[PDB]
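Case 204 in the screening queue. Each case pairs one protein sequence with one candidate compound; here the compound is manganese (II) ion. For every case the pipeline is the same: read the inputs, emit a complex structure as tokens, and attach any notable structural observations.

Predict complex for case 204.
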Amino acid sequence: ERILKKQPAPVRALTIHPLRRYESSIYDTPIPAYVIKHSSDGVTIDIATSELADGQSGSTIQPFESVPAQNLTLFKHDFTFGHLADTTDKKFVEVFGVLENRADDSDFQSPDMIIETETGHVYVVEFTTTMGDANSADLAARNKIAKYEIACLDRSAIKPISLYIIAVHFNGVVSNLDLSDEEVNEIVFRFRLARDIFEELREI
Ligand SMILES: O=C(O)C(=O)CC(=O)c1ccccc1
Ligand SMILES: [Mn+2]
Ligand SMILES: [Mn+2]
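Case 204 output:
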């Protein structure tokens, strides 16, 4: 029995912390070689993690990164943020039930994460990437906010919601999380490697 579930009710509202621009500081860091291995189910990326220095950026990458067939088209997105979410996409209805007397499209939207805490707070997290610059990253983040703001606001009448975004570009991150330099660098480092592996997968 969990006592933190027995607290008075929090304010039921939508909270959005402001977006901030972060710059990567990956200053000439080893990037691991890779070989794309044919598998029964999708591919497995054989990545030479032994080439990396202990604790350098990229230390969250696994020696063998499985990419099942069903996750292939979102590889760039999912490899980039794979150290933060095992998987992505959870439907609103799975956490809130149907909002109104009748279901509608907002019940079946699925941001990359919907996290419910014992204290009764819900965190909605959306990841996105861009091949553009920091200005393109800020625009992609604002587009994800606009995509989910209505569903979050309506469901905030049930449990309070905080909506977080991470948008990655080649040289940094736009996010309303409060990220360290090392956390920014991990996201960017994985995105940069993901871009490389993608140029190969698309040719194959
Ligand atoms: O674009 C993103 O940032 C997504 O997180 C997309 C996503 O979930 C998805 C799922 C199924 C089909 C197309 C996109
Ligand atoms: Mn998604
Ligand atoms: Mn996403």
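Case 204 observations:
- Residues 88-89, 112 surround manganese (II) ion (ligand 2) (CB under 6 Å).
- Residues 3-203 form one domain.
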